[PDB]
Amino acid sequence: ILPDSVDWREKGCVTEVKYQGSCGASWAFSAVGALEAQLKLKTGKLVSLSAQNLVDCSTEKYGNKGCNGGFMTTAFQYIIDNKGIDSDASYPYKAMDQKCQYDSKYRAATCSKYTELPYGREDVLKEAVANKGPVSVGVDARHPSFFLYRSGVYYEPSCTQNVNHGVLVVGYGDLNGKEYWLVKNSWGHNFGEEGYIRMARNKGNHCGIASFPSYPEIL
Numbered sequence: 001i002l003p004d005s006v007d008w009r010e011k012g013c014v015t016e017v018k019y020q021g022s023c024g025a026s027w028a029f030s031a032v033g034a035l036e037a038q039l040k041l042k043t044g045k046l047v048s049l050s051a052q053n054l055v056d057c058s059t060e061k062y063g064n065k066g067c068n069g070g071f072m073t074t075a076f077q078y079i080i081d082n083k084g085i086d087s088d089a090s091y092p093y094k095a096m097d098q099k100c101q102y103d104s105k106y107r108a109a110t111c112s113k114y115t116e117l118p119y120g121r122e123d124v125l126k127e128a129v130a131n132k133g134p135v136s137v138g139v140d141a142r143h144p145s146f147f148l149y150r151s152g153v154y155y156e157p158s159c160t161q162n163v164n165h166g167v168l169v170v171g172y173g174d175l176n177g178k179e180y181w182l183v184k185n186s187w188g189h190n191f192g193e194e195g196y197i198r199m200a201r202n203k204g205n206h207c208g209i210a211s212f213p214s215y216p217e218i219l
């Protein structure tokens, strides 16, 4: 029996909204955000993890292209293979591709595995968000309405289920009975509601929010 609303910010599992600047690293921000929640769940500590670590080090071997895009799933695999990821403080974000400068001295988190969810299943995504934690997802953000979003529940008739932007589902609920996913973006505080966007939920995988969900775990 799933709760009617969740918001992982109220459980203290979500770090502040980041600003990716001129670097297509949304995939890296989505991935670290998910792992940040699990790190807090396991250890009690909330620490921002290094998106730049992923940009610089999870590259061609993982199908990732730094500031030209990438995938959260293969980002998690990098963290597994690498046996760690650095804190954001120690490996700060520069919004550009750099040489890999991972240093295990400043390792703030580990990843044992990750799980993908089945394509288009908003019911399964809801369960995972309720029971596991924030979930990394892709959305179709290729529409001016997305970029211009300020408040309310986002609905874009010309959205597709193809995804081109990584974000973090940190919750769900309804606004006056209009169901939504609570989504943490990485375009700073001036995007949406202090960096957050409510996106239509249970409208047939609107903007592909449930097309490619994934979350990591730490044992």
Ligand SMILES: CS(=O)(=O)N1CCc2c(c(-c3ccc(Cl)c(C#Cc4ccc(CNCc5ccc(Cl)cc5)cc4)c3)nn2CCCN2CCN(C3CC3)CC2)C1
Pocket (backbone or CB within 6 Å): 022, 023, 024, 025, 026, 027, 061, 062, 063, 064, 067, 068, 069, 070, 071, 072, 074, 137, 138, 139, 161, 162, 163, 164, 165, 166, 167, 211, 212
């Ligand atoms: C079409 S589809 O939706 O059907 N789909 C096709 C199939 C697909 C899509 C996504 C997916 C899921 C989540 C996200 Cl987030 C993304 C993404 C993204 C993205 C794209 C562009 C940008 C950059 N934006 C423009 C920009 C450029 C430069 C700058 Cl500086 C600034 C901005 C950022 C993020 C993709 N997973 N899979 C399935 C897995 C695909 N692989 C992953 C790894 N492989 C290689 C073996 C390594 C095999 C399989 C997309």
